[PDB]
Each structure stands twice: as C-alpha cells, then as structure tokens.
Design a binder for this molecule. Structure first.
Ligand SMILES: O=C(Nc1ccc(F)c(F)c1)C1CCC1
Length: 209
C-alpha cells in the first residue's frame, strides 16, 4: 500500500531550483547528509542520557557510506533517532517551508547553494547528484517506513518490508548518470576529509568487491 503526496509548493520550487540551477560544486551534498546524520545521532544520544532503554534498538552510534556501482547508488546510513511516518511526511522532520523562504532570499542576496545547510533544508541537496532518493527510516516510536521521490512534485511513503534497520535512517541516492564519481572510493574519501573532518561519530566508507 503506497501513499502518494504532493510536495508543498515552496518545497517543489526548492527542488526544481536545486535540479535546474547550474552549480558545479555538487560535492556538498555529502557534507549536508552527513551533518544531518550527525544531528540525528546527537538526538538519540541526548535522549539516552536520561533513558538508557532508548538504545535498546541499537547501542552503536555511527555513519556508514556504502557505494554500489552495479546499482549506481550511494547509501548514507546512520543509527540516529530516525523519523516517524509523520516526520517523513512533514518534509523529513524539517521546517522546510520557512527554511526555503530564507534560503531563496539569501540566494538573491549573494549566497550560493553550498550554504543550503544554514537554512535547515540540506537534505534536498541530494538532488544535486541523485535522480531519485529513497529514505528508509525507523524511529523508536513508529514502524519502519520508506519515503521516495524523483522530484516532479510528489513523493511516496510506504511501510518498508525490507531488511529491518533497528533504528536510524538510510538515505539511498540513485545517482545521475554523469555523477558516478561519487561512487569512487578516492573521491568519497576526499570529500569526507574536506568537509566532515569534525563529525563526532565514526564514518566508515565501505569498499566494493
Ligand atoms: O536560487 C537560486 N538557486 C538555487 C537555490 C537553492 C538551491 F538549493 C540551489 F541548488 C540553487 C538562483 C541562484 C540565486 C538564484
């Protein structure tokens, strides 16, 4: 059972800008998604400070980067707090409407796309490199769900019957044909060292057969 939703108009406009604007510095998508993972890990860690049982769904707090050249996907996995179904529908737990408003004023007032994270909508920088994004998520207070969008004004949400995740979020980037450099080990390592050197969780870059 798949539910299809329309993006709010401001979010659709944000994704069309990210997709259509000529902007060569696409690598910041990875910094933005890792920083989102770090924020989600901070949240479950804080909650566990007063309720250890919050970590019954997984004690390890980490970030994995999994490239797959056969599928042409880059997956960013974290064991953070995750998202409820309501969170997924409400712009993946962001205040995306007011965030978009600010970001697009900043853009007309000098800023560039790389600053998207300062407006709380860094998730959508995934569409710099991905034609389709799938988000699998599990929050302690809800079931496992899969969100998906190829932009175009709509997204879907369904119960995920795939591999149980325990707790956290998995962002699966179905990369554009000309963006496969972000599956190469040496290019991912470069980006992580350049932009994510101070993330306080272990970031493991998986290698391929
Ligand atoms: O708004 C613009 N681009 C834009 C905005 C948000 C984005 F996430 C993005 F990738 C590109 C134009 C350059 C200023 C006018």
């Amino acid at each position: 059972e798949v539910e299809t939703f329309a993006f709010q108009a401001e979010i659709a406009q944000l994704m069309s800008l990210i997709i259509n604007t000529f902007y060569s510095n696409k690598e910041i998508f990875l910094r933005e998604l890792i920083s989102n993972s770090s924020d989600a890990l901070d949240k479950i860690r804080y909650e566990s400070l007063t309720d250890p049982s919050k970590l019954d769904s997984g004690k390890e707090l980490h970030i994995n980067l999994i490239p797959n050249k056969q599928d042409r996907t880059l997956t960013i996995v974290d064991t953070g707090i995750g998202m409820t179904k309501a969170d997924l529908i409400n712009n993946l737990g962001t205040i995306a409407k007011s965030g978009t408003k600010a970001f697009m004023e900043a853009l007309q007032a000098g800023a560039d796309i790389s600053m998207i994270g300062q407006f709380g909508v860094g998730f959508y920088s995934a569409y710099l490199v991905a034609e389709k994004v799938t988000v699998i998520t599990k929050h302690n207070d809800d079931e496992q769900y899969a969100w998906e969008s190829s932009a175009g004004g709509s997204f879907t949400v369904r119960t995920d019957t795939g591999e149980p995740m325990g707790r956290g979020t998995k962002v699966i980037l179905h990369l554009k044909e000309d963006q496969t450099e972000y599956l190469e080990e040496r290019r991912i390592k470069e980006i992580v060292k350049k932009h994510s050197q101070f993330i306080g969780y272990p970031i493991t870059l998986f290698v391929e057969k």
